[PDB]
RNA sequence: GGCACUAUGGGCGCAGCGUCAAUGACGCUGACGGUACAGGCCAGACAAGAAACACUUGUCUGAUAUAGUGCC
């Protein structure tokens, strides 16, 4: 049970630039196992990217990253380490260290994996989002219900958190994932759907809030009538 | 070369109590040394197989994997509600090891149309330079849905973008979100912006649209 | 890759000469070359060792081989 990982050394860096990622062992001695980096980039699958062999040392790289990552172990420190450099766009990633298991107990699985670090390479400084109403009216609604929303838009890094009426309305929200523009800025919208007969009665407003570059919004969606 | 995983299918749509079989080809002969995962959204992957048939200690039974050269199939006897999620295969049969993409395993249901919604651009955005047209489809299953953008009955093409939300919890629809985005002096360039859906609930292929410039 | 045929300086022959993680191999040229052996070295695959490789110890194969040719 008390075998366990833990990824660190995660953040921004710009494209060309250099990261180290380290990978805390515990619960075992990191001498006698396989240790690998497996990445996944936002909404991809998994990609294996490197690992090193118990009492060699030896070490082994995916293509896409060959000659620019070094994997390499301090067994006094029990940790492992993913040297990244020249990084790229595309390495854009929740980067996992696993362990394979021993071999007569488990094969060449791999049985334990940290719970990651995040990597974004990215030439996009900081930015606060834009905030704009989708607003409701007829084009909008559907019989009993009308649906309403607010557009994010061209915000960096990841995350915004959005909330309607300061939290209180949570049934219906859609809240999509976000977009990578090609600009390098994020865009989400949010939207929920309401009675219509409430377009008229209830005041609705979606909070923005970005930690990254400390902005809080507050936008008043409002009905759109004629 | 490297070695090719490929999985199949990349999705794949059951019920709780079916029995659920997924496949994994190699390129090449990867002997027995391959591994199976199971991975939860927003959490690391878990080890099911390993040596392509061994149940990984602690792994449910209903889980069982099998092999016939270069064809591995992962199958799961009869679901349980906790066997949603995706799955991948992983060669480590020789250096530098793969996966394979990924098949996901969604919770079935009857058929739902998507109720489609169009939200023309905010006069605030308006008056920044940018026109964005956002079209909504609620609660709609299967996840597979065509959105298809028209500027004055043109076809467009490489200016939206989409999401998709994760199915819901509760009633297991999807609900996704296209964007279409213009500068300024090109939305003021037409009249007639259209947002077509095609989608297995509906009779045929339903439009939302709006002329700009309309109360 | 297989099958048949041909031939074989230990897989390592002598002596120089060059490259390499050099009580090793690898490539050159020269000269020599009746046998058998035996160790030892070495190469290749593999097993186990917390072990995919490397390391250690062990196992199997090195004329049941290895070059050439012909054929599928
Ligand atoms: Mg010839």
């Known amino acids: 049970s008390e075998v366990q990982l833990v990824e660190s050394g995660g953040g921004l860096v710009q494209p060309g630039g250099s990261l180290r990622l380290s990978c805390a062992a515990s619960?075992?001695?990191?001498?006698?196992?396989?240790i690998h980096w497996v990445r996944q980039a936002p909404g991809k699958g998994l990609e294996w990217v490197a690992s090193?062999?118990?009492?060699?040392?030896?070490?082994y790289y995916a293509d896409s990253v060959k000659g620019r990552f070094t994997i390499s172990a301090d067994t006094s420190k029990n940790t492992a380490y993913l040297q990244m450099n020249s990084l790229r766009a595309e390495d854009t990633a929740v980067y996992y260290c696993?362990?394979?298991?021993?071999?007569?107990?488990?094969?060449?699985?791999?049985?334990?994996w940290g719970q990651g670090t995040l990597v974004t390479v990215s030439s996009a400084s900081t930015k606060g989002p834009s905030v704009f109403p989708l607003a409701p009216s007829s084009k909008s609604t559907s019989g009993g219900t009308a649906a309403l929303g607010c557009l994010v838009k061209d915000y960096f890094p990841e995350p915004v958190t959005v909330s309607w009426n300061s939290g209180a309305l949570t049934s219906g929200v859609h809240t999509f994932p976000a977009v990578l523009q090609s600009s390098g800025l994020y865009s989400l919208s949010s939207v929920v759907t309401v009675p219509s007969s409430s377009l008229g009665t209830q005041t609705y407003i979606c909070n923005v809030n970005h930690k990254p570059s400390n902005t809080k919004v507050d936008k008043k969606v409002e009905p759109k009538s004629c | 070369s490297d070695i090719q995983m490929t999985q199949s299918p990349s999705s794949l749509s059951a019920s709780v109590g079916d029995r659920v079989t997924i496949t994994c080809r190699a390129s090449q002969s990867v002997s027995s040394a391959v591994a199976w995962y199971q991975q939860k959204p927003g959490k690391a992957p878990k080890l099911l197989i390993y040596?392509?048939?061994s149940l990984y200690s602690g792994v449910p039974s209903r889980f069982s994997g099998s092999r016939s050269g270069t064809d591995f199939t992962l199958t799961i006897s009869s679901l349980q509600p906790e066997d949603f999620a995706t799955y991948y295969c992983q060669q480590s049969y020789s250096f530098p090891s793969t996966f394979g993409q990924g098949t996901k395993v969604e919770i079935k249901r009857t058929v739902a149309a998507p109720s489609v919604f169009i939200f023309p651009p905010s006069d605030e955005q308006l008056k920044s330079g940018t026109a964005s047209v956002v079209c909504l489809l609620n609660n709609f299953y299967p996840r597979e849905a065509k959105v298809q953008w028209k500027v004055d009955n043109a076809l467009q093409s490489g200016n939206s973008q989409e999401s998709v939300t994760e199915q819901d919890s509760k009633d297991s629809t999807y609900s996704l979100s296209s964007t279409l985005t213009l500068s300024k002096a090109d939305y003021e360039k037409h009249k007639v912006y259209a947002c077509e859906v095609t989608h297995q609930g509906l009779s045929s292929p339903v439009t939302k649209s709006f002329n700009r410039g309309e109360c």
């Open positions: 090193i062999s118990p009492y060699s040392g030896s070490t």
């Open positions: 040596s392509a048939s």
């Open positions: 619960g075992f001695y990191i001498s006698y196992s396989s």
């Open positions: 696993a362990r394979q298991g021993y071999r007569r107990r488990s094969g060449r699985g791999f049985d334990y």
